[PDB]
Design an enzyme around this catalytic site. Structure first.
Site, PDB file in Angstrom:
ATOM      1  N   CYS A  93     112.986 -38.717  65.459  1.00 17.26           N
ATOM      2  CA  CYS A  93     113.897 -39.858  65.630  1.00 17.26           C
ATOM      3  C   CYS A  93     113.244 -41.209  65.992  1.00 17.26           C
ATOM      4  O   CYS A  93     113.505 -42.210  65.316  1.00 17.26           O
ATOM      5  CB  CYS A  93     114.961 -39.511  66.681  1.00 17.26           C
ATOM      6  SG  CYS A  93     115.563 -37.802  66.619  1.00 17.26           S
ATOM      7  N   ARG A 122     107.056 -28.054  69.912  1.00 19.77           N
ATOM      8  CA  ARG A 122     107.734 -28.009  71.198  1.00 19.77           C
ATOM      9  C   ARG A 122     107.118 -26.922  72.063  1.00 19.77           C
ATOM     10  O   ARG A 122     106.839 -25.820  71.584  1.00 19.77           O
ATOM     11  CB  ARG A 122     109.235 -27.769  71.011  1.00 19.77           C
ATOM     12  CG  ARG A 122     109.954 -28.924  70.339  1.00 19.77           C
ATOM     13  CD  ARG A 122     111.426 -28.635  70.121  1.00 19.77           C
ATOM     14  NE  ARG A 122     112.081 -29.722  69.398  1.00 19.77           N
ATOM     15  CZ  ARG A 122     113.341 -29.692  68.978  1.00 19.77           C
ATOM     16  NH1 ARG A 122     114.093 -28.625  69.206  1.00 19.77           N
ATOM     17  NH2 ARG A 122     113.848 -30.730  68.328  1.00 19.77           N
ATOM     18  N   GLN A 140     111.442 -29.255  60.025  1.00 17.31           N
ATOM     19  CA  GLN A 140     112.881 -29.349  60.087  1.00 17.31           C
ATOM     20  C   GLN A 140     113.340 -30.121  58.916  1.00 17.31           C
ATOM     21  O   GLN A 140     112.641 -30.973  58.473  1.00 17.31           O
ATOM     22  CB  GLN A 140     113.249 -30.146  61.306  1.00 17.31           C
ATOM     23  CG  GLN A 140     114.661 -30.012  61.782  1.00 17.31           C
ATOM     24  CD  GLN A 140     114.816 -30.610  63.142  1.00 17.31           C
ATOM     25  OE1 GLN A 140     114.528 -31.761  63.343  1.00 17.31           O
ATOM     26  NE2 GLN A 140     115.245 -29.821  64.087  1.00 17.31           N
ATOM     27  N   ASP A 142     115.212 -32.924  58.309  1.00 13.41           N
ATOM     28  CA  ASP A 142     115.709 -33.849  59.308  1.00 13.41           C
ATOM     29  C   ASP A 142     116.118 -35.131  58.629  1.00 13.41           C
ATOM     30  O   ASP A 142     115.448 -35.579  57.709  1.00 13.41           O
ATOM     31  CB  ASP A 142     114.643 -34.103  60.378  1.00 13.41           C
ATOM     32  CG  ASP A 142     115.150 -34.966  61.519  1.00 13.41           C
ATOM     33  OD1 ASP A 142     116.384 -35.057  61.704  1.00 13.41           O
ATOM     34  OD2 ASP A 142     114.312 -35.542  62.243  1.00 13.41           O
ATOM     35  N   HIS A 144     118.112 -39.162  59.484  1.00 18.41           N
ATOM     36  CA  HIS A 144     118.864 -40.080  60.315  1.00 18.41           C
ATOM     37  C   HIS A 144     119.590 -41.076  59.429  1.00 18.41           C
ATOM     38  O   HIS A 144     118.990 -41.702  58.544  1.00 18.41           O
ATOM     39  CB  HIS A 144     117.949 -40.789  61.313  1.00 18.41           C
ATOM     40  CG  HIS A 144     117.286 -39.859  62.279  1.00 18.41           C
ATOM     41  ND1 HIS A 144     116.128 -39.175  61.980  1.00 18.41           N
ATOM     42  CD2 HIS A 144     117.627 -39.486  63.536  1.00 18.41           C
ATOM     43  CE1 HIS A 144     115.780 -38.428  63.012  1.00 18.41           C
ATOM     44  NE2 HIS A 144     116.673 -38.599  63.970  1.00 18.41           N
ATOM     45  N   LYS A 223     129.561 -35.048  68.894  1.00 20.67           N
ATOM     46  CA  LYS A 223     128.894 -34.288  67.842  1.00 20.67           C
ATOM     47  C   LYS A 223     129.801 -33.292  67.130  1.00 20.67           C
ATOM     48  O   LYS A 223     130.792 -32.820  67.682  1.00 20.67           O
ATOM     49  CB  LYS A 223     127.679 -33.546  68.408  1.00 20.67           C
ATOM     50  CG  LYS A 223     128.011 -32.484  69.445  1.00 20.67           C
ATOM     51  CD  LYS A 223     126.759 -31.709  69.847  1.00 20.67           C
ATOM     52  CE  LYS A 223     127.041 -30.719  70.968  1.00 20.67           C
ATOM     53  NZ  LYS A 223     125.828 -29.931  71.326  1.00 20.67           N
ATOM     54  N   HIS A 270     122.008 -38.271  63.659  1.00 21.03           N
ATOM     55  CA  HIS A 270     121.038 -37.196  63.520  1.00 21.03           C
ATOM     56  C   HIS A 270     121.699 -36.079  62.734  1.00 21.03           C
ATOM     57  O   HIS A 270     122.741 -35.568  63.136  1.00 21.03           O
ATOM     58  CB  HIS A 270     120.567 -36.672  64.884  1.00 21.03           C
ATOM     59  CG  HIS A 270     120.142 -37.744  65.840  1.00 21.03           C
ATOM     60  ND1 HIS A 270     118.820 -38.068  66.056  1.00 21.03           N
ATOM     61  CD2 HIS A 270     120.864 -38.552  66.653  1.00 21.03           C
ATOM     62  CE1 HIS A 270     118.746 -39.036  66.951  1.00 21.03           C
ATOM     63  NE2 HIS A 270     119.972 -39.348  67.329  1.00 21.03           N
TER      64      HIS A 270
END
Ligand SMILES: C[C@@H]1C[C@H](C)C[C@H](C)[C@@H](O)CC(=O)O[C@H]([C@@H]2CC[C@H]2C(=O)O)CCC/C=C(\C#N)[C@H](O)[C@@H](C)C1
Ligand SMILES: C[C@@H]1C[C@H](C)C[C@H](C)[C@@H](O)CC(=O)O[C@H]([C@@H]2CC[C@H]2C(=O)O)CCC/C=C(\C#N)[C@H](O)[C@@H](C)C1
Ligand SMILES: [Zn+2]
Ligand SMILES: [Zn+2]
Lengths: 403, 403
Positions: A93, A122, A140, A142, A144, A223, A270
């Protein structure tokens, strides 16, 4: 039904103590990997997503701005470079926030959808680590979405559609839940209210049932959470749609609107569908029982001859199927029975077995059996290739039957 | 001239304070990235290479085993995880050595060529860092060949061929250098002797002009160094062929020979062509002057309508070119001259400008102009798409001329 064992036996992937929480993908597993990635990419090119490539490490000041040292430090691998702190990115992000802030942007460019497959690390405890389900390293799918408050509604529609498509290909079912503003929250209540209004609206507009969890949202935004159900009847948390009003503030993101105001803040969405490629590979592995759809299968065509009499022709056949971009192998072993070879191919989960005899060599044709030993009988090489590429391109769930 | 500036103006890539030595690839630059990767991949599939996915981080014992701790430690980012040392991978070699040792392997499986695009991190001094030329994070087109000592000769042939082919597409020349056993070296003299014999042998077989740098080889093996020359007259060290006898020893790699003898060691061939994707992107950027070949270009087709009268017919045209997997944009601004639009499109290095008028909307056609301003006049959508597809597939060094 375990993805670790099935992983070992098909020579897809394995694990080693020298890198706990990280996976070793053998060529077949790697094929599956890239197949998933490029599936998502095709869908991206349909839906107006733009893929980017971002750094894997960042100075501590970025995790300062983003809120990760305050909140996420525990999960992050950090190290000191030239007296300054650095860390591997747990998420994509903030980098994307940097890309958005690269130059002045207008209303004309919104919504701006930036996608990243970049590697995420992580820090997770050694005793917590299991297989591909819980890992330290993952890629991922991913993205945005940077948009005006008002475009959000339409955007969410798109998002939902996106989900449907993907999962309709896998044959999964899904459940939706709306998590709204909690008692602990950061932002302007008006923004929250309009956002949640649009979310609820597009949810009803979508036409499928959902539950409202009422205050289970995060502190930085509302969300939509999605649960997928597979063929074994297992429920998984993979996809997410998460609004962020905070990140644009912390990074001071702005855009020019059509009425002239340049001080307007965007909304960050996201979004992920597959979750992580790794965990999705695990889920699919156990769901299929190691028995893969044709489009996803690292073993697609197995070419077998009847005897050394015609290996030259098996070789030509296999090559012609190789240049058509199929994963295709051949069994030339003289010390094996034809029936034994076919049985082994079917045990190795090859979707299609192409047997070549003398008629097959003479007429320029192949004879077709299936992983489940169905004999689709004899076909031209051309026809077989065309039909198989049809069944590939359309990602048929049962290809062997539908051939 | 300078790839940083060109990277800024074309919105390909940029750099930031918060991650020195890394890069931010905007959608266009990212397209270029994945395009290069896909090129190398296609050639891989032609040449019998198998791509794998390996962990980015490893326990310190691996880097101790490979010998990176006693040698390469200065360039490595290291950090502690649960009382133990870990590091990001400077190279893919040890991981691939792990993948070789996963299960017993026979002579029948050789040569085994494992390819990795994985992300590498090396620690360079902040004062050394410039653009994409000297970096920290980079992705390398990396492969390790595992082969029997004999097969080496043939293998090198392949390697050489591969180089030629790739550079034939780019138009680069190259000079070859054979670096042989140094004074300080590690290994059995006879092994070195046979290896170097085969190297010289395939070198002369190739038919090119090579030079002999007796003594300038690595302590762990002999090597073929390749220097490429571009169209500016600059020489670059990118591609390499490096023999390694030491790595199979340190990781205790063996294979069952056709003797029945399992104790035989494989020879490892480290090979790269593009070097790092980043470096090659810089080189190509400066070599092309920001003006890309049609197949590498993030801006391929721009559709320009003359009057709003048919803004929509161009909507249709650009869509049909978008689904042909071309990178295609459109200029709908009513506040611009047709001419200004065209020359803006060529200043933006769009390869083909499709002008769309009333006649074009009527007859279902397009009118073609060229980044350099050539003019191919009306042509139907079909043959235009087909020709551009052929020029994309064959990777023409000039599409603009040969259309
Ligand atoms: C840095 C903190 C960390 C929060 C507290 C993390 C929590 C554990 C949850 O909020 C995680 C979450 O749902 O993140 C979401 C990730 C998408 C799937 C999920 C994923 O990748 O797991 C996305 C949120 C990213 C959020 C930010 C950023 N940047 C926020 O601005 C900052 C303030 C969040
Ligand atoms: C740990 C040392 C590092 C050496 C001493 C560093 C030198 C600068 C060169 O040897 C590096 C080199 O050319 O490596 C070569 C790399 C391919 C392009 C080049 C590349 O990636 O730069 C390949 C060698 C990899 C080697 C090993 C491994 N594993 C070796 O067994 C150990 C001994 C390497
Ligand atoms: Zn995110
Ligand atoms: Zn190597």
């Amino acid at each position: 039904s375990d993805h670790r064992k099935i992983g070992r036996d098909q020579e897809l992937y394995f694990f080693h103590e020298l890198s706990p929480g990280s996976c070793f993908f053998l060529p077949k597993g790697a094929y599956i990997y890239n197949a998933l990635i490029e599936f998502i990419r095709s869908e991206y090119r349909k839906r107006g997503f733009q893929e980017v490539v971002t750094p894997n490490i960042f100075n501590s000041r970025l995790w300062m701005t983003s809120g990760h040292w305050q909140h996420y430090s525990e999960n992050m691998f950090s190290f000191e470079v030239e007296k300054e702190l650095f860390a591997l990115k747990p998420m994509n992000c903030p980098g994307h926030c940097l890309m958005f802030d690269h130059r002045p942007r207008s209303w004309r460019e919104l919504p701006l959808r930036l996608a990243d497959f970049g590697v995420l690390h992580r820090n997770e405890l050694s005793g917590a680590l299991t297989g591909l389900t819980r890992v330290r390293r993952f890629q991922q799918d991913d993205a945005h979405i940077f948009c005006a408050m008002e475009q959000i509604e339409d955007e969410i529609k798109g998002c939902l559609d996106f989900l449907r498509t993907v999962y309709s290909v896998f044959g999964f079912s899904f459940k939706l839940n709306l998590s709204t503003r909690p008692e602990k929250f950061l932002g302007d209540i008006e923004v929250w209210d309009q956002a949640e209004k649009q979310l609820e609206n597009s949810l009803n507009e979508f036409g499928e049932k959902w539950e409202l969890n009422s205050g289970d949202g995060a502190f930085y935004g509302p969300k939509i959470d999605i649960q997928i159900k597979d063929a074994i009847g297992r429920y998984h948390q993979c996809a997410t749609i998460q609004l962020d009003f905070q990140l644009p503030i912390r990074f001071n993101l702005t855009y020019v609107s059509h009425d002239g105001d340049d001080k307007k803040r965007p909304v960050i969405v996201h979004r992920a569908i597959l979750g992580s490629v790794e965990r999705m590979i695990a889920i699919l592995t156990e769901n299929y029982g190691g028995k893969w759809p044709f489009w996803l299968s690292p073993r697609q065509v197995m070419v077998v001859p009847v005897g050394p009499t015609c290996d030259e022709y098996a070789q030509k056949v296999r090559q012609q199927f190789h240049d058509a971009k199929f994963m295709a192998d051949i069994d030339l072993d003289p010390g094996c029975t034809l029936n034994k070879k076919i049985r082994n191919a079917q045990l190795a989960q090859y979707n299609f077995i192409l047997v070549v005899g003398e008629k097959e060599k003479i007429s320029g044709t192949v004879n077709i059996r299936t992983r489940d030993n169905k004999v689709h009988g004899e076909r031209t090489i051309s026809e077989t290739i065309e039909r198989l590429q049809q069944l590939k391109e359309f990602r048929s769930k049962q290809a062997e039957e539908e051939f």
